[PDB]
Amino acid sequence: SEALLEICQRRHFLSGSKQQLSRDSLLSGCHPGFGPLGVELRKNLAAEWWTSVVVFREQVFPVDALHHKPGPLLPGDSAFRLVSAETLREILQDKELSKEQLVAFLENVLKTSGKLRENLLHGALEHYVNCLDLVNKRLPYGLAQIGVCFHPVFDTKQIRNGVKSIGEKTEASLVWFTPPRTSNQWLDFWLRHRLQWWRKFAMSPSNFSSSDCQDEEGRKGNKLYYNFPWGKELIETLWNLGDHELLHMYPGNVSKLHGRDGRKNVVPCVLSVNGDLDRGMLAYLYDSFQHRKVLKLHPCLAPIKVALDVGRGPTLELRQVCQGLFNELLENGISVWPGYLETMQSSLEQLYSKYDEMSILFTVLVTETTLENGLIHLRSRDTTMKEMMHISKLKDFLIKYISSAKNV
Amino acid sequence: EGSEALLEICQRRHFLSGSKQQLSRDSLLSGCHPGFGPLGVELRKNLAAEWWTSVVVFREQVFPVDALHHKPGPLLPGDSAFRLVSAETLREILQDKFLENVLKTSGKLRENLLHGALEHYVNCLDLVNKRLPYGLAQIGVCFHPVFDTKQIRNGVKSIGEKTEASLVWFTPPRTSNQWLDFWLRHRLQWWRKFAMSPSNFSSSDCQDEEGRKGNKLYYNFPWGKELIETLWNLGDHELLHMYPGNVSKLHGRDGRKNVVPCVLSVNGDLDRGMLAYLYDSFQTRKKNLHRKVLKLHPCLAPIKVALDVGRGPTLELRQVCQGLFNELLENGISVWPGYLETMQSSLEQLYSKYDEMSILFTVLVTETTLENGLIHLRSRDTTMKEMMHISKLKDFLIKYISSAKNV
Amino acid sequence: LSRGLHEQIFGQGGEMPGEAAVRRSVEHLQKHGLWGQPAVPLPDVELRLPPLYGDNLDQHFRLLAQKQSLPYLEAANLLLQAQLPPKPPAWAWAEGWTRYGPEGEAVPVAIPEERALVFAVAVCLAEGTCPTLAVAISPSAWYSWCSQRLVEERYSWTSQLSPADLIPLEVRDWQEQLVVGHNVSFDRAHIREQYLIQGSRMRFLDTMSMHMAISGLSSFQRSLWIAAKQGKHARRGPAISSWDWLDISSVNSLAEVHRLYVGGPPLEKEPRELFVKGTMKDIRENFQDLMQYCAQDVWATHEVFQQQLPLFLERCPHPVTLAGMLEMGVSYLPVNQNWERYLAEAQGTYEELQREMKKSLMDLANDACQLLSGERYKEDPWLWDLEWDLQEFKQPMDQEDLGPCSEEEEFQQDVMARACLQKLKGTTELLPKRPQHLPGHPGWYRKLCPRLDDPAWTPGPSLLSLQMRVTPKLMALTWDGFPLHYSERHGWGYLNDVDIPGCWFFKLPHKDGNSCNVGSPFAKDFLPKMEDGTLQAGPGGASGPRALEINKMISFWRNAHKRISSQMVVWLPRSALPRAVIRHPDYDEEGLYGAILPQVVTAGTITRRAVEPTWLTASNARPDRVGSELKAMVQAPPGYTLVGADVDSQELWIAAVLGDAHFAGMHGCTAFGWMTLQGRKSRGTDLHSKTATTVGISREHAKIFNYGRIYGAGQPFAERLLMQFNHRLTQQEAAEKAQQMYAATKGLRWYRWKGGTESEMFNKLESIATSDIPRTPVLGCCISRALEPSAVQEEFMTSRVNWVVQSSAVDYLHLMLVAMKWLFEEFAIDGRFCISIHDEVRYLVREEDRYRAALALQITNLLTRCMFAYKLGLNDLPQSVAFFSAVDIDRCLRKEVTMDCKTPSNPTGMERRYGIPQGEALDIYQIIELTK
DNA sequence: GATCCCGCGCGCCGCAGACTGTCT
RNA sequence: AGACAGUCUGCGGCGCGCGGGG
């Protein structure tokens, strides 16, 4: 809503000109990219998702999926986001027309050249055969990947011929092969884990919610929406697709795509989990905002943790201390905003408001008293409390704060 | 042969590269390979993390930026190589009644991410208070046109994908050359890092056809020298080209004077770097050693340690490794979830298997681990096994990785 | 005209050549060389010199030196005969300067308002380099300085505006000031006003410089003196049989100097060494004791100076010596921010290179451990004599399962495992046997990997270097043969198993090299001998090439990064810089402009040759050594540049002119000065590579021969040099003179003993050395009083004959310095600051007066050479000499205007100009600012 | 030349200081 | 059983050669 998109446009969370991004077109991918703060927030979210889903699970491996389909023997029925997929000159959906010999099935431009991927599931299905050997015919295992996908947009008033504008969405996908038996149990397990993960970083987890749905082909599915202020917008989907999707590929032969479970060969059942990392970022940004204007992003998700600054004292002999502290913090893996090299002192209140809008956990001020006795001023974003801390304990305090925030 | 042949073997087999019966160096270099295996993906991720830490971390005034894989169709001068065809074969003009035959006024897939950085320059100029010296870094996939230049069966040009890491550095014109030399020095320093034979990484100077200087970095694969990274002094040409309205908006403060920045573009191909490191890690004059092993650097090795349980009291007592597994998983130590093969295999084949995947250490838990807990710890670099401590394993691994990072 | 002599601006025809002298000279030239060798007449230039005071070119320099050195001599005399009160009871503990009046009363004072002082400074070596405390004595009172860092807080490492302040405000008589001290350069380095770009009217006297001037000693003399002073007591060892100099000589340390020049009780030496190896806290606790020790040192130095000044004046009567020493006591070296950058790069690259050297070796170790598994030490011909460490420390779920519940695992296993580990196996809990199975095939591979009690055992073998004697046999046949055997029974590679290079099959034991009387060491061969010498091999990778090359690349920086990267550099603030530096192009950049004081001893060795380990050394920017770019990064600030040059073959010309003057009154009398003047490579008879082809290996490889011969090298040195050349036999080499000694004394007495004859006149140098009277060579400076043959008679001839020429060169330098100071004083040439490296001289000068100063160094050189020739000679001088070949103008400091480097690999990018040497193009102007 | 340095590893000892079994 | 051999560790001196500059 108002007063939020402006704050995000400022402070370089969402890159673009005023009214370019707007509230609409952010759910779709047809908007200018994120700002550096937005990019860092997205990277943090992706890292947390990777930690929770891939490396701790002990059976989920990364998979490499290309951005484009090959093109030969391309079926004539598909979404066809970009029928070309060639270097340059994407011919978009290209529905209807192409009735002449030119640009026909012969050669490129008729569901012949190739298409850009719309989902990460197909790459996982392709790699499943080798990834079986990776886990040694152990049937229950998953393949995870975070990547960009391209989708077509429509509606948006009357444009005569549709522009099929390309929307880019950064999505995290997990394809979990499990015995067809007890597949619903794994569906419920993954649904619960994903809902808990999404609720973990939320200030108000009640906004995050789950709903159930049925499919003619898939057995059952679940959807997560988060209940944006204007309404509910689907942010994650879980589907029990079944084995027929996998059976469609590798149509020939049998007893090659099946795996061993309880020493019993069976064709696996695939669960597809797909979450929208960009929409998740937008949802978290809305959640953090709420009478000062402050974005209370989670400590594990905030792009910048601490901010350095200089107050009074000599211009020199403080820049060296600030540089030393900066180097120590980066050596210890803490992101810090180097505000010490700012030249217009401006105001303390304005400075604090600016850093609050940037969602910085702590504000650190170094003055001549730091040279005297090694004490720096520390302000907390959450409770706007100012205290004095020894400069040698800031790193340990920040690490402890981050660790405590990470735990329940 | 063993020269670029056995390297491809034990690469698809151990899931460092996608297995599609390719075994084609040209396909890997161009980007037509099906993909990378999980080990390859992890190695590339580690390399990207190291590049990010060395370039944008520990470097103030450098910020991240995201460039869309596509750009809007309108105002797209030029055309694709195969889209320009007007020689013959106009037999059917029977079609009745955008579209057309010349470029169709449509979008394109980016071949480089420098354009996005140049676009975001103006927006990102505010967060540095217009301090002209500053950079934008980004790692992303770029699409290029490649063809076998043989026969017509390939038909349209094939499309290759390459993961490129690019930094666009805006610098005052006066200091442009020195800053470029500094960057060329820091990239050559970083590529020689993690390398068992840094001499194989080399640098050369080149001149643009407009007279703009630049540098090229190469790795000496067994067949020859292949380009990996390129540095170019763009000379504020494209930046002015995209902004023809007024020059006031482009004015950044250098010292105490407002100037138009000069652009330096340092773009490296991460996939080729991964391939180069894989080749370098692998190794005949009175050798009589064999023992194939990928001696990758500890900082970017995909898997650090491997766990296993041998001749214990029972398979139910394996849980001692469980938790310890989790204990290693804390603080981000990647461990191979072994102790689940449950197949009677000779320990020599098992050790060779883990050697080929470039795992620094092999941990074996025996029946004597429940009391006076000692675990057989074998090292990749030398085939000697230690007992060491269960309690100190986490700290020992942390220390090993940290010391590898700094000499 | 005549024999290419210049136009005689000053002097008359009172001197006559002498017909007999002319006949003898031409007869000798015909006998040795060719009488008729016409040479192209050089262009003749006439310019109006400044008016020279006095007559005969000696009164001029005497008057200049006296005018320069009068105020400082007055100050020294004031300090000479001024008694002092006793030391105060208790030193004041306060910030700044305090003056101690009668009965110990202490009063705070801004700075000592005194004409002369004896000054000493102490620095807390443990932390930083800022001064801690200082004590000084004036003719009337004591002064103590306490640094602001006595309080507790954090301080920067920039070290600007911190050190002591000693120069009063110029804007109430005798503005000149003299500061006396033992190693006074160190104390001058810690003064505020000495780092200004503009000059100041303060000078420094070093008691150590005087000690080297009078009662000094050489390096061999130093070793003999130290041995004699020790309880107990090489190669030829001909004995001495003359030790009288022990009672008159001494070592440069303050204690020994005070003992020699004063018979008082020995100075008590503090054993705590709180300043060198103690924190600032113990300094605070031991304030009074340290202040007392510093005051004792100052008092001892004052006594030494009192006993030395009249003796020095007696033994160096010429005022020019004192004036030149005073001028050379003030050096300056602008650095700017790039210096810091250099300290980074030269460091980082060095570390990087070390890594490249280290990692490869580590691999060679690791792959060797695998030799343990096969039990095949005999298979390896290199490691079978190695230890090999024979010893060791000796210390299916077939169910679907899946879908866990929300419950959490009990875990609790790690705590129990840690308890069982720590509690049980008590033996290992203390002193754990880290080696276990690691030692392997390499000789105790555990040793190579750190012990780790403090190190933590960094990955792989990190205590592995190229000279452990383990690196050979780890790279196959790199060193000699299969065995290295650094101990007895060494590799017989010399400098098929016995004598024959390279050990194979273990033929004979013990030392059997029998080629150079020793063959124990390995590698250490400048010629690689890995292409054709053979006996070099390896498995591939950092073997042979890329092995010794890194070593030679980082050898210099290895034992240099301590002296370098620690020089006391002071960065001036913006307000301190002058008008010229500001409001000038360049400038700005948010850059630091600073200076380094070389800390140079004005007379640090026999003669009065200045000594500085980092700055006064002959080293160029070779494109193979990491730290080779030293002497660069000394670029002048904006609006300033370095103007100067070297004086060509100073030593050879001095020897030649001395020999000519001794033989006759001309400049080509002995056929050696003629060869030095009328000798060219292309046509003339050059001394090098010509007139000596009959001796040695052709024209080449003959420079060092003649250089050593004129520096005192004897016949056996030449025989040894020839023996290794062309593998000639000892019988083939002439034991007697024969081909050798043709230039030097060949006939010895030659009938008619003493006398050199032949091409070179060693008679003058030998006569001066063996005079037995205070030597007083050209310009009159006596010898160090310890190398004399009078009352000592030590027969250390190699030392005094070389002392003659070297002290003559130092006299030349003093004359150059005094002339330059006079020229800068008479004409308003800003930038009086100077730097000197033996013959090489440089001056920091403004760009506006750059060409006027470039014109200078030409009248200075002309007057210096005309004054040299005037003593025991006639005023006329060769035209070719008496004028510099070129005068460098480049902002930085380098051997030649055109440049090259190794570490940067592109140094022209960092705002480096060319240097535009002048040569003859600067001789089209007068030295008045009015003139153009 | 000049004999002479300092920064390495070998080595080759020595003597305290600590820990571990070891002896009576 | 308590007291005394070793092993290790600390640390000190002195030989051996090698390399920048005098």
Side-chain angles (χ1 to χ4, degrees), chain C residues 815-832:
Chain C
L815 284 161
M816 264 193 312
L817 290 168
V818 63
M820 290 280 345
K821 186 167 178 55
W822 159 57
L823 277 206
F824 272 50
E825 181 38 5
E826 183 65 13
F827 311 102
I829 311 179
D830 276 19
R832 198 255 301 108

Side-chain angles (χ1 to χ4, degrees), chain C residues 303-319:
Chain C
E303 293 180 352
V304 161
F305 167 71
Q306 269 190 170
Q307 298 302 127
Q308 237 166 18
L309 185 69
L311 191 64
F312 168 77
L313 290 180
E314 180 260 322
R315 294 185 68 83
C316 289
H318 218 298

Side-chain angles (χ1 to χ4, degrees), chain A residues 74-81 83-98 104 112-157 159 161-218 220-308:
Chain A
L74 188 68
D77 302 330
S78 175
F80 288 139
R81 162 50 251 170
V83 175
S84 206
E86 76 183 0
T87 315
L88 320 191
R89 303 295 159 288
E90 294 193 359
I91 81 182
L92 325 188
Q93 235 287 11
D94 203 54
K95 216 74 180 63
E96 305 93 32
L97 314 180
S98 297
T112 314
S113 38
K115 64 168 186 292
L116 288 185
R117 58 145 181 252
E118 264 180 23
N119 62 338
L120 293 83
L121 168 64
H122 208 265
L125 297 175
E126 282 159 15
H127 283 283
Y128 160 81
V129 176
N130 309 325
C131 294
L132 223 38
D133 183 16
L134 177 75
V135 82
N136 178 347
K137 299 309 309 309
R138 284 180 252 270
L139 181 45
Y141 82 98
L143 302 173
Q145 183 178 4
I146 316 180
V148 195
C149 295
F150 316 88
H151 300 75
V153 315
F154 56 107
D155 312 301
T156 58
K157 319 308 182 181
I159 329 174
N161 193 292
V163 302
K164 307 305 168 299
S165 174
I166 318 176
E168 256 161 323
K169 293 188 178 182
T170 306
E171 300 176 350
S173 104
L174 161 78
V175 173
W176 180 260
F177 318 102
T178 166
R181 163 260 313 293
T182 66
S183 64
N184 280 328
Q185 301 180 183
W186 273 119
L187 174 60
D188 197 339
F189 172 87
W190 279 118
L191 176 276
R192 176 172 49 78
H193 263 265
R194 296 271 80 233
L195 189 59
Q196 153 185 342
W197 180 93
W198 278 101
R199 283 164 183 265
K200 167 159 56 174
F201 310 107
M203 275 221 319
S204 58
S206 65
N207 281 125
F208 280 95
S209 53
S210 177
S211 179
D212 208 323
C213 54
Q214 201 74 22
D215 191 7
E216 54 269 1
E217 291 289 331
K220 284 169 297 315
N222 287 98
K223 283 189 168 59
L224 317 178
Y225 304 83
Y226 155 98
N227 180 267
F228 270 96
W230 60 83
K232 314 189 77 174
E233 300 288 338
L234 183 272
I235 80 186
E236 183 149 34
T237 200
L238 308 91
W239 283 116
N240 193 341
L241 301 170
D243 67 328
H244 63 269
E245 267 78 15
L246 185 57
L247 285 173
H248 195 279
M249 168 180 333
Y250 325 108
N253 203 59
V254 76
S255 72
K256 153 162 294 313
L257 50 71
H258 67 162
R260 181 177 65 83
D261 176 71
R263 206 177 268 234
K264 144 175 77 275
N265 300 123
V266 74
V267 177
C269 179
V270 309
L271 293 109
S272 70
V273 202
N274 199 85
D276 193 356
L277 259 51
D278 299 323
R279 198 170 295 191
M281 149 165 30
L282 211 182
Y284 273 146
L285 289 175
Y286 260 93
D287 180 26
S288 307
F289 191 78
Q290 300 299 137
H291 58 274
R292 72 190 205 280
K293 300 174 177 61
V294 49
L295 306 186
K296 291 201 186 71
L297 260 43
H298 201 259
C300 323
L301 292 184
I304 275 144
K305 311 297 171 53
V306 59
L308 298 176

Side-chain angles (χ1 to χ4, degrees), chain C residues 220 223 235-236 427 430 468 486 713 717 802:
Chain C
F220 189 41
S223 97
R235 279 157 290 181
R236 50 213 193 69
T427 63
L430 294 135
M468 306 220 304
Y486 173 74
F717 154 83
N802 292 349

